[PDB]
Amino acid sequence: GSHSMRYFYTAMSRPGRGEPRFIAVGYVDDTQFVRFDSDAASPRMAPRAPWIEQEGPEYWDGETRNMKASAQTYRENLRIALRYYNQSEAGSHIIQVMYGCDVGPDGRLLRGHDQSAYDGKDYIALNEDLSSWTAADTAAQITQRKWEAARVAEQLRAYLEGLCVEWLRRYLENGKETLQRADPPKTHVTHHPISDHEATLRCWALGFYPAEITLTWQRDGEDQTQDTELVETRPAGDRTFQKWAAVVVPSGEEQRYTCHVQHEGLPKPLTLRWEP
């Protein structure tokens, strides 16, 4: 199917407690494969998936040099942001970045991404055209004018259309046994009486990859969206994910409810019910 590569940077200032911490992680789809932490005893880009381990010393040295330079850049950006927002040097603030590419089955770029935040709020974003910017406030407009002058969007476009796509395809080939393998959910419905007049039906999905999934309850064929409790999809720890959906039903009407499951690893969407 389609695939993505994404890098996530977090830069966090901490006055009185040394220089800002810089953490970077890299993902292919829902699989983390590298990390960098400036707080580590010996900061380096390090493997987090087995298939990246076959890359040589030139790769790892190159990525480490880049992360160290990046940490320095975002420490400077944190100081700049203080001036843009009239803030003092005493507070702790955070810059976040998230960029990457999506490719389709044929390995061609579907679209690119490069978006930044300040203190958890949108700051600036590269538009889908990869040639212009969306700035969220008057501070980000200052950055936008700088990046327009230095033609930064052109550099990003070159990366998103070139190296990003080429290396993602490389990773997809080296890790094809796992990255190009979907694991379907294992599903069942549980039943727990609340009282004499009500029961909880809970539809479980376990051991699936990737994380994208849809679980819905129907009553008499009608979606019960506003009455369903849906927990956030959660990692199991072995690369796979878990999710459940629950509805409270009148006792004796359990069989009027059906759970519908959609996942990439299933040939067709699944319909299941409580089997007493």
Binding site: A24, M45, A69, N77, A81, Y84, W167
Partner: peptide, 9 residues
């Protein structure tokens, strides 16, 4: 493979 960051905010 990560992007090279050049220009500041």
């Amino acid at each position: 493979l990560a992007l090279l960051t050049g220009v500041r905010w």
